[PDB]
Amino acid sequence: MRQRTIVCPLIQNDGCYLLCKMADNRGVFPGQWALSGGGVEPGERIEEALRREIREELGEQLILSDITPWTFRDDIRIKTYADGRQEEIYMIYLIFDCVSANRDICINDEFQDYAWVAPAALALYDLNVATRHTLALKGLL
């Protein structure tokens, strides 16, 4: 029963949403599509954590017009060990609406590809579970 808080940006430009394709040895299923995001370090505000993770994962050339808190949600993930023993990980997600003023992306090693996706197409991507739950809540699927 361990605990993680994740800050997640939902980045939009010109009506399209940014999705990133996870690198081939990341995730339980490799090469799923996802929102970027990460944890909040001791000593940092949640918006400071968000902006740092954007720069790290998507590069310094991406210019944000604004960032607004949207909503939160939670999930339990199970980690199953080699002998079938399990541990639960309790995740809280803090989701921000982000509008970017441009589309210049430089992905880091966590990702292998990215796309700017029309809302109608989002559901059809092989989204990871977290990303599907988030976009579903937003009414985009």
Q: What is the DSSP string of 7-56?
A: EEEEEEETTEEEEEEEPTTSSSSTT-EE---EE--TT--HHHHHHHHHHH
Cβ 32 vs Cβ 20: under 8 Å: no
Domain carrying residue 2: 1-141
- Resolution given for this structure, in angstroms: 1.9
Cβ 93 vs Cβ 134: under 8 Å: yes
Q: How far apart are CA 134 and CA 94, in angstroms?
A: 10
Residue 27: exposure state from Cβ atoms within 10 A (0-12, 13-18, ≥19): middle
**Total of domains in the chain:** 1
42: domain CATH number? Answer: 3.90.79.10
Cβ atoms within 10 Å of 28's Cβ, excluding its own: 10
